Design a protein around this ligand. Sequence first.
Ligand SMILES: N#Cc1cc(F)cc(Oc2ccc3c(c2C(F)F)[C@@H](O)C(F)(F)S3(=O)=O)c1
Lengths: 107, 110
Amino acid sequence: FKGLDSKTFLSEHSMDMKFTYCDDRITELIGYHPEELLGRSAYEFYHALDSENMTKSHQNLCTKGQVVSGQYRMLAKHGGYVWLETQGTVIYNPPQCIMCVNYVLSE
Amino acid sequence: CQPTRFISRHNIEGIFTFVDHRCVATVGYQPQELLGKNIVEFCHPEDQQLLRDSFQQVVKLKGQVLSVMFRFRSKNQEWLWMRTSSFTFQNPYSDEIEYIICTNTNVKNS
Ligand SMILES: N#Cc1cc(F)cc(Oc2ccc3c(c2C(F)F)[C@@H](O)C(F)(F)S3(=O)=O)c1
């Protein structure tokens, strides 16, 4: 049994959805090292069956400024898929970036 | 019967910068659903790294044809087998960064 907290990590993304930052906690959960993530779009990682759905969540995020993804799968670093749910928030300045609070469902 | 194919151009990173409208009937997306996204975003996880190394090498090959086979996720969320043949072009009156011209054909893997 992991704490909900030990299943939660942050990531930051450019508006094109590439990773610009990821918490190191993602390593223990999904296998990736945060630095191999940078410069790659989130879309590289979504299960094909969740892809159009995430595309819609993204549209809502760009229109409303904040979205809850509802459920999707991420390809793990060493095969297979982890279910997640994400809260996304656009940080606009005077859009600058996307803050993602990611919770791993499938323990 | 005519194979289904469409032309695309990409930066050296893989981002679609031009999409021929024959893509609708080939993979089902409109050009602007593809433009500005990386081609690896439509690629099957098992084929992603092959395709990234293919873009990396095509620019080393003196403008000769590099071919690659991979699964591409149609607008139906279905994996289609693509053969993408690609080559660099760089206008020799200039020193602008080369880019990559692709032809993309739905082929049989069998
Ligand atoms: N697989 C995956 C994955 C793993 C992560 F740690 C973050 C991530 O980026 C996401 C995930 C969910 C969403 C997004 C992102 C994103 F910022 F890249 C946003 O599109 C969104 F609009 F907030 S969203 O809820 O659709 C995608």
